Amino acid sequence: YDFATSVLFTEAELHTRMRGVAQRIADDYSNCNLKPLENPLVIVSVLKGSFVFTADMVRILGDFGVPTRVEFLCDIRGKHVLVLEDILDTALTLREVVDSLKKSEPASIKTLVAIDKPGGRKIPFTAEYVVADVPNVFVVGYGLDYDQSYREVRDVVILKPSVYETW
Amino acid sequence: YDFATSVLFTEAELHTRMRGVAQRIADDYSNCNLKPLENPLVIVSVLKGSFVFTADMVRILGDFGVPTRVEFLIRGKHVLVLEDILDTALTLREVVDSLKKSEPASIKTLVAIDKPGGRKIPFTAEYVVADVPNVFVVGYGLDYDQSYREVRDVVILKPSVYETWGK
Ligand SMILES: O=c1nc[nH]c2c1ncn2CCCCCP(=O)(O)O
Ligand SMILES: O=c1nc[nH]c2c1ncn2CCCCCP(=O)(O)O
C-alpha cells in the first residue's frame, strides 16, 4: 500500500478469524432458540466505521445458522444483544454502551470487536469475542479511518507517519 | 435458502456486476482528481440496510482507484448516493434534492436493486447494479421486519412468511 508501512491483517486473515469466532458464537448461543422474526440475535453496531465489520460478521454469522437483527449507534428487553465495534482501545466508548444497553434488561449481552488494543485500556474491560489483536500503533482499513478516509482499504494496515504528519 | 422461492442475484453476481459499475464510476470520475483526505468521493448511504451494499461497494471502488468517504443518513465535493433498493424513488428524490441545497460539486446515485416499474415519481439513477420487478425480495441488506439482512443473496421471500408474520 502506498500509504502504509505494514499490513497487519489482510482481508483473508480477518475472514478466517471471524469464521472461528462465528463457530464459537453459534455454540454459545446454541440453546437460545435463535430464529428470524421471532427471536433473532440483536446486533448493535457502534461507531461509524463498524459497518464494514458488521456487514461481514453478520453474513458469516448467517452461514453458521446464527440469525441476526442489526441496529446502529427499545426492543432490547428480553432479547439477546451482541455489540460489534470496529476497534477496541480505551474501552470507554464500549463500557458506556454496555452499561446503557443493560438499562433495558436484555437476556444476555456480550461484545465482539474486530480490532483489539489491550495496551490502550483506561479502564479494565475484556471483550468476549475478539477477531484480532493489534499493538499500540495507529492503523487504518477495514472501516478504520484517519479523518474519514482509508476506510475502503480491504486490510488493516499501519498508517504511514508522513501522511498524518503532513495532513 | 429454503425459506424463499427464488434466488434472483447471488453474492458473486452482484460483485461481478459491481466490478463493472466500479470501472464505469472510475472512468466518469477520472478528471476529478480524487485522492484520500484532500478530495475523496463522498458516499452518502441511506435506508439503514444499505450498510451491506456500502461496505462492499466502497472496497470494490477502492480496487479501481476510487477513494471514498462514507456518510450515513460536504460542499464543493463529489457526492454519490447509495441505496440498497430503489422502488418509488420518494426517499432518494428527497435525499438528493436535500443534498443539492448544500451546493455539492456533482451528485449522482448508485442503487444496488432497482424496481423501475413501481415508481411514484420520475427518477433515473446514474448507476444500477441489477433490476427487479414487482416481487418482494430480501437479502444483502434488504430486510423483512429487521430480519434476513444476513442473506448473502438477493432472494424473493416466501409469500407465507409475510402472510404468517403479518398477522
Ligand atoms: O488505530 C486506530 N485506527 C482508527 N481509530 C483508532 C485507532 N486507535 C484508536 N482509535 C480510536 C478509537 C475510537 C473509540 C474506541 P475507544 O478508544 O473508546 O475504546
Ligand atoms: O423487496 C423489498 N425488500 C425490502 N424492502 C422493500 C422492497 N421493496 C420495496 N421496499 C421498501 C423500500 C423502502 C423505500 C424505497 P423508495 O421510497 O425509494 O421507493
Numbering used by the authors:
A (entry chain B): 7 to 79, 102 to 195
B (entry chain A): 7 to 79, 104 to 197
From the publication, what sentences describe this entry?
However, in T. brucei there are no enzymes for de novo synthesis and this parasite relies solely on its salvage pathways to make its purine nucleoside monophosphates.
The binding of 6 (with five carbons in the linker and hypoxanthine as the base) is similar to that observed for 3 (six carbons in the linker and guanine as the base) in that the purine base binds in the purine binding pocket and the phosphonate moiety binds to the amino acid residues surrounding the 5′-phosphate binding site (residues D117-T121). Compound 6, with hypoxanthine as the base cannot form a hydrogen bond between the exocyclic amino group and the main chain carbonyl of D173. Compared to 3, the purine ring of 6 is translated by ~1 Å, however four hydrogen bonds (two to K145 and two to V167) that hold the purine ring in place are conserved in the two complexes. Compound 2 (with guanine as the base) and 6 (with hypoxanthine as the base) both have Ki values significantly lower than their corresponding nucleoside monophosphates, while the remaining five ANPs have Ki values similar to or greater than those for the nucleoside monophosphates. Common to 2 and 6 is the fact that they both have five carbon atoms linking the base to the phosphorus atom and this is a key factor that results in tighter binding compared to the other inhibitors. For 6 the well solution was 25% PEG 3350, 0.2 M sodium iodide, 0.1 M Bis-Tris propane, pH 6.5.
